[PDB]
A and B are shown apart, each in its own frame.
Chain A
Amino acid sequence: FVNQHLCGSHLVEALYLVCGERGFFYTPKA
C-alpha cells in the first residue's frame, strides 16, 4: 500500500503504520 502518490494526511498515516512504535518525523519543507 506504500507504492503510490501519498500526500497530506495520507502520507502521515502511511508513516504511522510503517514506523510503528519507532515513530517518525514529518518535515514537508525540508
Chain B
Amino acid sequence: GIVEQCCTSICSLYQLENYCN
C-alpha cells in the first residue's frame, strides 16, 4: 500500500492521486 510505495520507496504524484476520494 501507500507506505511501501511512498515511505519505504520514492512516491509520485501519480501514486498519491490514487488515494484521493
A contact set with B: CB distance below 8 Å: 2-8, 11, 14-15, 18-20, 22-30
Size of B's binding interface in residues, CB under 8 A: 16
Q: How far is the CA of A7 from the CA of B8 in the complex (A)?
A: 8
Out of A3, A5, A11, A19, name the residue touching B20 (CB < 8 Å).
A19
Which residue in chain B gives the minimum CB-CB distance to A23? Answer: B21
**Main SS of the interface on chain A?**
loop
Could you tell me the distance in whole angstroms from the C-beta of A4 to the nearest C-beta in chain B?
6
Out of B2, B11, B12, name the residue touching A26 (CB < 8 Å).
B2
Which residue in chain A gives the minimum CB-CB distance to B15? Answer: A2
- The proximity string for B residues 1-21 relative to A, scoring 1 for CB distances below 8 Å and 0 otherwise, is 111001111111100110111
